[PDB]
Design a protein around this ligand. Structure first.
Ligand SMILES: Cc1cc2nc3c(=O)[nH]c(=O)nc-3n(C[C@H](O)[C@H](O)[C@H](O)COP(=O)(O)OP(=O)(O)OC[C@H]3O[C@@H](n4cnc5c(N)ncnc54)[C@H](O)[C@@H]3O)c2cc1C
Ligand SMILES: NC(=O)c1ccc[n+]([C@@H]2O[C@H](COP(=O)([O-])OP(=O)(O)OC[C@H]3O[C@@H](n4cnc5c(N)ncnc54)[C@H](OP(=O)(O)O)[C@@H]3O)[C@@H](O)[C@H]2O)c1
Ligand SMILES: [Mg+2]
Length: 309
């Protein structure tokens, strides 16, 4: 059954925490663990980082933490590095169910020369590699939390939530789904439909697949899960199979859910949104509907939630 979480007072706040810690005085958190989430055929390493904030930096699902990697800002000598934001991949209780830790899902940004394929570590992403190189006991300068776009609307505990993720964009949805299905949260008993669409390069690049597959077996009437493996599958037009192609496979069901009030969420690569828009426009046209008018209504009704970068 559902996992006991503590402390219940994390349910008491009526507003999300925002900017509890600021860049000039970050919170010095401590790494609990770092593990790779991916197999040897993944095009790069994505890691899961558990950070002990001690209950000092609580957050709500869908928010981000800022991380200030060590060193000086290259474009401002004597200045600290700029904050990098990471969508929190844990619930407010965290992976130890105690309100003391939060987790990040971090893709290492690695530079390869486009001609020779030669790596150049000096051009690798600073914060992503800092995080995935971290070890238990290391310190992390945390800021935030921040963000409200991806807060989970809980007013209707039987709402429908359609979650579209590419890569580490799955992060907020891991938190949503743990709150919906895994944790014993007495004041939020989810009885709606949660539908996760996840796009990753191949099977080895799947993130948290065992957890999501477990929800299919535990909550078959409340959870659906579809994957787009871009380098393992092709769409009906011959392109790499992307999440928008999976959305198209369920176009009638998704449109009906949207018409019925479903929330739809997009997180991950900003480049997926033009493709999604094109697909939804095409679906709508085949149904004799205007996607522009439908999207305008979804936005007006606060059903449309996008955080991509
Ligand atoms: C709200 C929000 C949430 C986010 N959530 C997540 C998340 O959950 N997980 C996640 O992985 N990311 C997420 N990101 C992205 C994250 O904030 C960082 O931008 C990302 O990790 C890269 O930061 P970095 O410090 O590693 O790279 P940076 O050091 O900022 O470098 C940026 C890029 O430039 C490249 N680069 C550097 N120097 C050169 C050069 N000379 N020539 C060519 N290229 C170069 C690097 O390889 C890298 O790809 C999020 C972003 C936002 C805005
Ligand atoms: N809140 C936020 O804003 C937030 C949170 C988390 C992550 N992010 C961002 O989300 C991105 C996740 O990237 P990642 O490195 O984890 O993923 P990735 O491996 O680069 O891509 C994930 C999947 O998306 C596919 N993809 C590429 N272009 C696409 C398109 N135009 N439409 C649909 N799918 C497409 C990729 O396929 P191919 O590579 O095979 O084309 C891959 O299968 C990062 O840029 C990260 O910074 C943002
Ligand atoms: Mg795997």
């Amino acid at each position: 059954s559902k996992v006991s979480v503590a402390p219940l007072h994390l349910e008491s706040a009526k507003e999300p925490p925002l900017n509890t810690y600021k860049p000039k005085e970050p919170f010095t958190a401590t790494i609990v663990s770092v593990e790779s989430l991916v197999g040897p055929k993944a095009p790069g390493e994505t890691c899961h980082i558990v950070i002990d904030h001690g209950g000092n930096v609580p957050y709500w699902e869908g928010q981000s933490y800022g991380v200030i990697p060590p060193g000086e800002n290259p474009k401002k000598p004597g200045a600290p590095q700029n904050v990098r934001l990471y969508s929190i991949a844990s619930t407010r209780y965290g992976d130890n169910f105690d309100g003391r830790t939060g987790s990040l899902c971090v893709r290492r940004a690695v530079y390869y020369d486009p001609e020779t394929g030669k790596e150049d570590p000096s051009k690798n992403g600073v914060c992503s590699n800092f995080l995935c190189n971290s070890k238990p006991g290391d310190k992390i300068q945390l800021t935030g939390p921040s963000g409200k776009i991806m807060l989970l609307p809980e007013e209707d505990p039987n709402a429908t939530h359609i979650m579209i993720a590419t890569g580490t964009g799955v992060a907020p949805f891991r938190g949503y789904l743990r709150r919906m299905f895994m944790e014993d949260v007495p004041n939020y008993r989810f009885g709606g439909l949660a539908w996760l669409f996840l796009g990753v390069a191949n099977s080895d690049s799947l993130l948290y697949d065992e957890e999501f597959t477990s929800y299919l077996k535990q909550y078959p009437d409340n959870f659906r899960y579809d994957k787009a493996l871009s380098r393992e599958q092709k769409n009906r037009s011959g392109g790499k199979m992307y999440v928008q192609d999976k959305i198209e496979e369920y176009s009638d069901e998704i449109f009906k859910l949207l018409d019925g009030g479903a929330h739809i969420y997009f997180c991950g690569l900003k480049g997926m949104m033009p493709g999604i828009q094109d697909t939804l426009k095409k679906v709508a046209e085949r149904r004799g509907e205007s996607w522009d008018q439908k999207l305008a209504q979804l936005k007006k009704n606060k059903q449309w939630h996008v955080e991509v970068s």
